[PDB]
Amino acid sequence: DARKQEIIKTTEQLIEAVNNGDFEAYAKICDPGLTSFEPEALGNLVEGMDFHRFYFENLLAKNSKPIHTTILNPHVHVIGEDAACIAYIRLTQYIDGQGRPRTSQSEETRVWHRPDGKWQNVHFHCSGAPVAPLQ
Amino acid sequence: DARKQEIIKTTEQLIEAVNNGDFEAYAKICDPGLTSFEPEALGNLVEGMDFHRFYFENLLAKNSKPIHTTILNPHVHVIGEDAACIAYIRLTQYIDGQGRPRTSQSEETRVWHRPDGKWQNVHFHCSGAPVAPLQ
Amino acid sequence: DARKQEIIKTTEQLIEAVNNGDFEAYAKICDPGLTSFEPEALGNLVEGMDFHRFYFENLLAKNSKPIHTTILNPHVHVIGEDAACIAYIRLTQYIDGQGRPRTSQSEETRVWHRPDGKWQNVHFHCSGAPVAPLQ
Amino acid sequence: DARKQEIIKTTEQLIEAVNNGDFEAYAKICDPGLTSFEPEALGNLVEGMDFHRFYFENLLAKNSKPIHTTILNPHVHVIGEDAACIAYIRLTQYIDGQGRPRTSQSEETRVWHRPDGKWQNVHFHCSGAPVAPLQ
Amino acid sequence: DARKQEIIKTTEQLIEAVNNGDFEAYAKICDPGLTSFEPEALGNLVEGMDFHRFYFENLLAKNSKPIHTTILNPHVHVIGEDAACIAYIRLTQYIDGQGRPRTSQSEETRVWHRPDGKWQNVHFHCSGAPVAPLQ
Amino acid sequence: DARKQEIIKTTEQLIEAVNNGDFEAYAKICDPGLTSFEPEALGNLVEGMDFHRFYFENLLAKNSKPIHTTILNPHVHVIGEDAACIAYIRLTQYIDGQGRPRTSQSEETRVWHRPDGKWQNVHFHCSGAPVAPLQ
Amino acid sequence: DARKQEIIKTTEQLIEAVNNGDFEAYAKICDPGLTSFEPEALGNLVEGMDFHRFYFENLLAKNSKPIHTTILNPHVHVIGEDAACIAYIRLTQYIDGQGRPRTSQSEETRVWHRPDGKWQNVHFHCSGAPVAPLQ
Amino acid sequence: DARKQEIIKTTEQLIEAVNNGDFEAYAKICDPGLTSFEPEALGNLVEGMDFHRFYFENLLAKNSKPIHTTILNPHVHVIGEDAACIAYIRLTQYIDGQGRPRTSQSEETRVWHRPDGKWQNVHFHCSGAPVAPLQ
Amino acid sequence: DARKQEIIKTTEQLIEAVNNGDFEAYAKICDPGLTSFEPEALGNLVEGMDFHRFYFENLLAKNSKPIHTTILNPHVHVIGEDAACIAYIRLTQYIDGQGRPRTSQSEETRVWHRPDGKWQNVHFHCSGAPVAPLQ
Amino acid sequence: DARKQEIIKTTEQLIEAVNNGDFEAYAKICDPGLTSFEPEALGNLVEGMDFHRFYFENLLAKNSKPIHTTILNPHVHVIGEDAACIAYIRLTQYIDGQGRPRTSQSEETRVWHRPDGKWQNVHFHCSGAPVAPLQ
Amino acid sequence: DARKQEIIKTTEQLIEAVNNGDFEAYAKICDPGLTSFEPEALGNLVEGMDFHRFYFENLLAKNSKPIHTTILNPHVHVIGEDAACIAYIRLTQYIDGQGRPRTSQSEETRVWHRPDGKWQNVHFHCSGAPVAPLQ
Amino acid sequence: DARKQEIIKTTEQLIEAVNNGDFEAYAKICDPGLTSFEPEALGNLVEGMDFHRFYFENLLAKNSKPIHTTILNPHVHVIGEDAACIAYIRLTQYIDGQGRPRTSQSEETRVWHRPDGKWQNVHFHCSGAPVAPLQ
């Protein structure tokens, strides 16, 4: 359970670096060849950092309204000593463009490798609501 | 490229065992603790074989109409010697309940481990069209 | 955990007596003053057995098609020695009126009392899909 | 009828502490392990206080417009001396974001335990309109 | 409570004479100048028996499928010794044109007079679902 | 026709006391145990004055725009000397939230008793448009 | 009232000649230069018999199912000794293409002249449901 | 053709008195017992001046924007020397609530009598767009 | 008026040759370079006979059900001695694919030239319903 | 081709006089008995100048925003020496009520005569988008 | 114009080989590395013959109903002596799944190369209606 | 691969000249007889520069908000030494009319010729989202 709690802790560091808009910390968690599927990419497989960079510069660095996030039913597969995978449900509570509280759901998969003693993310898949909020 | 072609070959064996309705071969490719996200599970994370078993018994063992499948733009991450991940776009051509040809798209992620010298699947995530066909 | 497994076992006996259409076993699990909220009652609070009796006589005793049910994330509150409450997510896999497999979800609460040494159900609440199937 | 009037009185204290935005009184009525089903949680079972805390901080502490609430057809099950359950219909009259009066309906179940001589809430289930108002 | 139970009993005789298709008994319960509002009359006030006669001749005398009816929360006003009024919610369980069980709701008011020692109906108002079933 | 004109006159006094917002005159026309069905109550049977009080305090005491009302095809049943019933179509002409004239229709039933020499209202049923105007 | 009852009687002869499919009697009631507005003419003013002839030949001579018609609130203007006008609401009860009873409403104006001692129809206007039934 | 041109001229005087908002001239053209069918009356037959008075006071006396009206294909029936009927298509060109030109269509019937040497209107029927404009 | 009646007569010969399915007579009325706009051509300008030929071969030669056509408000421009233009509204009464009478409207323009002593059609424009019927 | 270029040139003079709002030049191109079909006339045949005059006075004399027009695939029929007909597709590029560029399509027919040595327009037919722009 | 007529002729040979279902002639016109965009491929770029092969085997070899095709406004770019490009509008007239004639439109681009003395197709792009017909 | 990288480089120069609003550089890349299919042209084939000029003058020269563009899966056909064709998927990230980031997809084909030693564009085809952004 010690190695599973380590993957959980490192995944929580990713999620709070994203919602802080901290792109310089996000870039240290991600591999340069990272690939992803997500609702914003319209069914295409994205590669590298530059597609995601646009949302840090146009939302996450600029926003100020309160947000709360719940992680439900996490499951971890540990795949030897170099590799791991985590899957969870995410609920986000947020304030819309006219002051009403709202909720949305996503389903997320993250794939982790340990090159050079540090855990880094190599592939990501998301379903459900967009991460760009529906305000 | 040799190890990447091996993951491609093993992923093609999974896809043809599914569309043949060969549940006894499917059960040798999958780990007993396998987890999944897919459109049929309504946003929930499924564990084990028994949710999928229902579709082999009520479609895949019984169907006879022609189907064709195209795999587009595959990408493989090889994660040491025990682990790998593959991501691809899938297009399926099928005949509906009244003889008309149709097309649908999915986006798929599969996570592979090599316990006891044999590659086996430990997590799967699907977006887009259901695998239960829209006939 | 022994008393929690007992409530789980007794709740599984209720669910299989319903999907067998066994109204004479259902009547031994329920209290005569049982109350319920469910989608079929259109927002009203029902009392007694006679509202439910209609669905045993017009579906559950007559149906023959295959059904599978998954219970997800159960939680039990044990409230002294006489009382308990259980909450769970239910997924049902079923065949429609033209041979296609389908899925639906409900959320369920059940309240249990132990009069005369036997566990019996006194209140029930359901949300999501109707239990009368969407075939 | 004396013990039933006591559960009614305590349920009315909960409802007025919520619509006053009095989170410090709400926290004394609820057990720390409380679970719930409600429309805002999107079909998931919530545990603990922190999901509900967001609506006290972003609505109930800040609102000033007039509200009226009617409780219809309450039913109480008393389950020995430590335990009780209550079920009722709730109608709420409220003013929208442009000054028009509106109405909405919910159906609610609440499960009560008496640890250490004080009644506290251990499970809650809601159907119908959200508690976050449709202004 | 004796006179209220008499109005309840006489109202149950009306409802079962209607669902039996017994127009010759219905004609003995109704005053010749009876007026009504109901969904089938498109917002108009009907007078006399001949508008209702059409539904006995084209449904109620001819139907054979099982029907169940629940009366909820009845209230009676007794207005001296010659007059009374009753108000109730009606739920009807029925089988559709393809064998599926269904539910519908109406709200009903009935006004009763005692000319010549016999109770007879002088005005009726219905809201909600039509009495002609939605099969 | 003299007693019928008296019920008509008293019903017109009710309608103008409501559209003046005169809740202290409305309370002298109504019995303390009065019951009603209306579109604002969402299919439920309301009892007493406090549900209606909210619309006097949040509209009828505060409004200033011109309104005109037409009563069509009234019918009266006189039920001995203590009791009467009246039924009519109501058309209301009103100005919306942006200065355009509009029309709406309701169908209404009212039940009258004469305790202590004064006519008072004991039950009411409404269908069609809400009495809260669609501005 | 004698001359008004004569216009009513002659208008009832027209309506029953139409629903019998008796085009040879209809042609004796109508002036050769008769004009009309009705839903079937798509906003145009029709002149003469030949537009209406098509509905006698393709429905009214061929139909066999039961129909009932109610005339509501008739008003007559008598305009000297040669001329009259009548206006009424019409409700029609009919059976659809699969055996269910249905209702529809129209509003109708008819203009009458007495050339050569016989009343004949010179202009007609209809609003609401089409006369061609919605089976 | 002289008597037909007289009815045309008098009908044009009505139409321009209405669009000027000249209710004191309108009241001299209409009979005190005039009846009408029109889209604003929701399927009911109106009698007298007071329903129409509301639109003079809340639009026609207050408006200032340009309007143009075309009368198409008029037909006149002259019914002895005391009575006449006219039927026509009306097209209205108008400016909406945000400055765009718009068009709408009605179909109209008007019935005229000559009491005391002066032509006056006794019945009116309208179909298509409301006369209260769709701005 | 003699030359206008000649264009009317020749236009009626075209319309009855079309609804008879008489393509060999249609080909004698049309110029070889004829152009047209119509709903079936999806906004394109068609040239020559071969686009129209398909509807003679697949409907007009094969149909048997009764059809009636009304021509409304025709207008003719005569343009010297060689040339003419006609414009009219067309109403068609027809029986649908399940035996119900239906109506549809078109607006039509036709341009006529007299080469070699015989009138022939050189351009046609249609708006409204398709001539291929909505059965 | 010289006479065809003359009709093209004169048709371009009409189109630019319209979009300049130059009603005094438009009136010299049109014959006083001109007829038209267009979307703004709701399926009716218009005659003379006064229907079109309203759009010069309420838009074309007042507008200032940039517009561009493309004429596609023109075809000309020359019908002796006094008469001609032209048909074309028209695309219009325009700025909406909030500054965004938009496109729309019409199909147009125009009929030309040469009385007194000057070409003038006698009939016009339009389909597709209205000439009043959809800003 | 000789080389342009050659590209037109070769493009007509492709279109008739497709609608004959002649896959062995289609394979001689296409380059082995051919790429395409079309509505059936859901926004993806297809490569090679095997995606198209499915529609020959499941429609074009099996169909028997009459089809007609019009090519509108073709444009050819000739790019030295080895290469050419053609663009056209295509209208297809066809019979649906219940015997009614229908029309649909596509816009098509085709790119041609002359390796080894024979013209062959290297890229294709289609917009508008699918080539799999909407029967 | 050198000649393919040259076509890629020249295609990237076109795309950045367009999103800079640099119409004087765009005019040096395009042939004077260039043809195109695109969503803005409503299914028509455009020729020359003047249709596109309108979007430079009314958007691209005036806009200031941030935009990002991704080119996916490019494919090049090189057709001797004078000619080439390129096909790709384009994703655009942009800010809407109220500050929210958005995504859209197009599929694009471009045909290139080398007259006088300089590459120039002769035909273009686009599917999917309009190039005028959906803000």
Author numbering:
A (entry chain J), B (entry chain C), C (entry chain D), D (entry chain I), E (entry chain E), F (entry chain H), ...: 408 to 542
List passages from the publication reporting this PDB structure.
The calcium calmodulin protein kinase II (CaMKII) is a multi-subunit ring assembly with a central hub formed by the association domains. The AD hub, which evolved from bacterial dimeric enzymes, extends the β sheet to form lateral contact interfaces (LCs) needed for ring assembly, while the ancient dimer contact was preserved as the vertical contact interface (VC) in the mirror-symmetric two-stack hub. Linkers with variable length and sequence between isoforms and developmental splice variants, connect each AD with a peripheral kinase domain (KD). Here, we present near-atomic resolution cryogenic electron microscopy (cryo-EM) structures revealing that hubs from the α and β isoforms, either standalone or within an β holoenzyme, coexist as 12 and 14 subunit assemblies.
Cryo-EM maps of 12-mer (2.6 Å resolution) and 14-mer (2.6 Å resolution) were also obtained for the β-isoform. The superimposed structures of the 12-mers between α-isoform and β-isoform had a root mean square deviation (RMSD) of 0.35 Å, while that for the comparison of the 14-mers between the two isoforms is 0.3 Å. In contrast, the tetramer δ angular distributions extracted from the 12-mer and 14-mer hubs have substantially broadened distributions relative to the narrow distributions of the 12-mer and 14-mer parent hubs. The δ angular distributions for the parent hubs are well-resolved from each other, whereas the tetramer distributions were superimposable with a mean δ angle intermediate between the mean values for the parent hubs. Importantly, they suggest that the 12-mer and 14-mer have comparable stability as their δ angle curvature deviates slightly higher or lower, respectively, from the most stable δ angle determined from the unconstrained tetramer sub-assemblies. We found the intrinsic LC curvature is intermediate between the curvature of the 12-mer and 14-mer hubs, consistent with their native ESI-MS 1:1 ratio for the human α hub.
